[PDB]
Amino acid sequence: QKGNQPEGSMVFTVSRDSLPGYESFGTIVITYSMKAGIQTEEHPNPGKRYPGIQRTAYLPDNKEGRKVLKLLYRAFDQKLIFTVGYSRVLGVSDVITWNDIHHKTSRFGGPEMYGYPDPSYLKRVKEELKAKGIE
Amino acid sequence: KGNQPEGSMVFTVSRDSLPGYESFGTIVITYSMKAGIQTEEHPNPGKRYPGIQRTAYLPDNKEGRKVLKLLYRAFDQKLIFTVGYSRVLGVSDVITWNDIHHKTSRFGGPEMYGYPDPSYLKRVKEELKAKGIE
């Protein structure tokens, strides 16, 4: 239902250029700009500061991509796109992290590079949103 | 020449404007950097670092396009990123910027690494000149 995402903003814009696998369409560019803050009782280490982050994600500008954009706005409103805590790979804590809804942060390079082509990505991200009760 | 990890730099444009640069579009630069193993040119040779993805923004005006061309040269000369200490993460052994500052937000001004910031394009050109890209 409702998460512990930091304060911040979500905006988007579009480019006429295409993503691999979606050559008939332009590209949605989502920018998240999240503020530095102090962990609340809603976070794993209350009282400890965390820095802000900035992240950009990409979607094809087609009916399905715009539906996912709408669902991501819903998740952002429900404070579910990001959380604060441990970041698995580096094993650092007290940082802003993603929250199990994967975003393509590269245009190209396929899944190895968190980019396109990735023909099942839109289906996968919808599954991840549904797991948060967002459909 | 620097010691930037393997990776790619691409750009595209949006018709929407950045604060302070009304009636020009927005250049969107995407950097896609591969995980790797530190070389002898890095601070901890032999240690692995994970890949990163970063997007940066510039106004699509004359000055912004000049900066884009210079950033392409810097990327070609392996100077945009390095591997080392990140104060944000509080660790080293990660892919970091290399003292060529990028705006990773559209909005929110300097505190958010975004626009408006009337002195940014001058600053980034100076930082490029410091690496001999001019």
Swiss-Prot record, chain B:
Record PTM text: Autoubiquitinated.
Cellular localization per UniProt: Cytoplasm; Nucleus; Early endosome membrane; Lysosome membrane
Transmembrane segments: none
Induction of the gene: Induced by IFNG. Induced by IFNB1.
Assembly mode: Homodimer and heterodimer. Can heterodimerize with DTX1, enhancing its ubiquitin ligase activity in vitro. Interacts (via N-terminus) with ADP ribosyltransferase PARP9/BAL1 (via PARP catalytic domain) forming a stable complex; the interaction is required to activate PARP9 but is dispensable for DTX3L catalytic activity. Forms a complex with STAT1 and PARP9 independently of IFNB1 or IFNG-mediated STAT1 'Tyr-701' phosphorylation. Found in a complex with PARP9, STAT1 and H2BC9. Found in a complex with E3 ligase ITCH and ESCRT-0 components HGS and STAM. (Microbial infection) Interacts with encephalomyocarditis virus (EMCV) C3 protease; the interaction results in C3 protease 'Lys-48'-linked ubiquitination.
Family listed: Belongs to the Deltex family.
Role of this protein: E3 ubiquitin-protein ligase which, in association with ADP-ribosyltransferase PARP9, plays a role in DNA damage repair and in interferon-mediated antiviral responses. Monoubiquitinates several histones, including histone H2A, H2B, H3 and H4. In response to DNA damage, mediates monoubiquitination of 'Lys-91' of histone H4 (H4K91ub1). The exact role of H4K91ub1 in DNA damage response is still unclear but it may function as a licensing signal for additional histone H4 post-translational modifications such as H4 'Lys-20' methylation (H4K20me).
Name of the protein this chain belongs to: E3 ubiquitin-protein ligase DTX3L
Species of the source: Homo sapiens
Species classification: Eukaryota, Metazoa, Chordata, Craniata, Vertebrata
Gene name linked to the record: DTX3L
